[PDB]
Homo-oligomer: A and B are copies of this chain.
């Protein structure tokens, strides 16, 4: 049998807007900041880490091809610790946590860090013709940010797959704008009641008026009213459109990480843990319907966990698009009060490579706030996949 994996500590940055407060912080900078902090929060020496795994999708500079290693080293981890970067698109952050946990499960390590880091503001343009030349004719500057949001098979924006999911599963424009408005309100509540304070690492943003601490998710609209959403126009299809800029998640910058140990190593260190890993699962779906990826992934994870949907006190199911999150809640039969209690992608943002690790942090801190037992963390994946993990508060 495989060893048990304990999550001793976790942290996240505040989520920055596209072109906002974190646009000057590279992904390796953010990665290192969260690495150093989870080491501190867990009281673990950087010399005792067995593995580092980071999720990350859009390379913004050469260093990013070394992201996990740079975040680890500059985060204070000894140079003898291996470092891996993983890309499962929007699930990369949770995948990183899964991969790090596997090294503990398999006995290759008894300490491992799993996280993600992404700065979409710094997403580059590429010139595929620049190495060997165009010779003649106009060439293209390729938007790698928009390219990461396009299905590679039909070359359609991820939002077109959201419309496919809305049409197929019967999700109205009214229903989408409902989830969007509430998400903003739950998040505004969370920021007001301070539910995010402990999990967020503040970052001093060197402004010209003197430094200021960036410690609040800036995508949230605190004045949210339903007219703000009904006035918007569908962005991804010309006819019979329903997905808008308002009911679809933002594009954002952020990083997050968790530190994990084997059950034995955590016992022998007097660390007060957040939770323990119960199970995980992966699934693939039709790429044209990638939004409902979380449904089979969540169902397989419950099977491995020996649990039922009704045992889940906290559900972090990323709101990539209101169109698909409604169908996920509907097809699984979830209690919308237990799903994204404090908002998600629509309100908080979607720093794709980091989202999976970031919402794992949310789920665990929510479990402590409410004294719950089981949390589900799931999200959809461009190209047609889903990923899901279940944690137990302890």
Contacts and interface: CB of A to CB of B under 8 A. Distances in A.
Contacts of A136: 131, 143, 145-146
A130 B140 contact: no
A80 B296 CA distance: 10
A383 to B, nearest CB: 4
Interface string A93-117: 0010001001001101000000000
A249 interface: no
A356 to B, nearest CB: 13
Interface residues of A, number: 81
B126 A127 contact: yes
Contacts of A122: 128, 131
Contacts of A146: 62, 136-138
B131 A134 contact: yes
A125 B127 contact: yes
A19 B132 contact: yes
Contacts of A70: 152-153, 383
A79 B108 CA distance: 31
Contact of A66 (B79, B282, B286, B382): B382
B133 A131 contact: yes
A65 interface: yes
B89 A66 contact: yes
Interface string A138-150: 1111111111101
A131 B135 contact: yes
A385 B69 CA distance: 9
A123 B133 CA distance: 12
Interface stretch (A53-61, A179-187, A207-215, A263-271): A53-61
A150 B150 CA distance: 30
Nearest to A77: B284
Choose among A1, A61, A102, A144 the residue with the greatest number of B CB atoms under 10 Å from its CB. Answer: A144
15 contacts: A2-B2, A19-B132, A61-B128, A66-B383, A67-B87, A79-B285, A80-B285, A82-B385, A85-B87, A85-B88, A124-B142, A125-B139, A130-B141, A136-B143, A140-B141
Interface of A: 1-2, 19, 23, 28, 51, 57-63, 65-67, 69-70, 73, 78-89, 95, 99, 102, 105-106, 108, 121-148, 150, 152-153, 281-287, 296, 382-385, 387
